[PDB]
Design a protein around this nucleic acid. Sequence first.
DNA 1: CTTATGGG
DNA 2: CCCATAAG
Length: 246
Amino acid sequence: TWLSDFPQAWAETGGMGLAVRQAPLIIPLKATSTPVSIKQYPMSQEARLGIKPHIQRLLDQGILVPCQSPWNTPLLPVKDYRPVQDLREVNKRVEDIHPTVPNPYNLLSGLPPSHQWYTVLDLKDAFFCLRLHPTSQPLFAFEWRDPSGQLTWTRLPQGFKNSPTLFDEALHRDLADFRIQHPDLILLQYVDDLLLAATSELDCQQGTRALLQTLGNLGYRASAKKAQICQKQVKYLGYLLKEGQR
DNA sequence: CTTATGGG
DNA sequence: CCCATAAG
């Protein structure tokens, strides 16, 4: 199977990712920023029990760690429960970066009619593959209690305004060589959503093999369940790609 | 939860 | 102004 041939590349069989070639990210603050500590709105037991197993998994994974920080932002008390951190006051204090992720419309414009064999992959827990420098970790702290202390992220967090752009730029750096090694393939990147396009089913199969091997080696993980491999018809970024249309 | 937005 | 809505 595509599964069995590339155990390392799939989130299902390769374990949590970690982009080993990428330096831990340092997040520069605006020139006048100082830490803000927003109190945690009391959370119901129902919400707390719902959130708890997720927090424990992240701690087990090393993705969350205990800390003491002058920064604090709230977790949503009503967030099936998944914890959602309100990072808006942190976002306001972080220096802006240029938005380099192309809009899907423009991204798709670089897909030639010559290449009508497609593979679509989405990377699982993409942001969590990027390490955060210890100096930047305290920025993202929140409170956690089991009826008290803070935890923070050791990886690029959800809800942080620059995560999509920083991830897209990091993956571009990591996939630069693949592009050079396969000049006859088309590779479109939209943060964690990838489209590989080839001239033939054969080229697409071989290209897809190489891309999975490369992604796996670099520490990224693709969803095997959602993968669309070597089809002439795929769903990518809300479009149906068919017969060179869309 | 809080808050930014804008139709009505 | 009010609010439904969306989003962190």
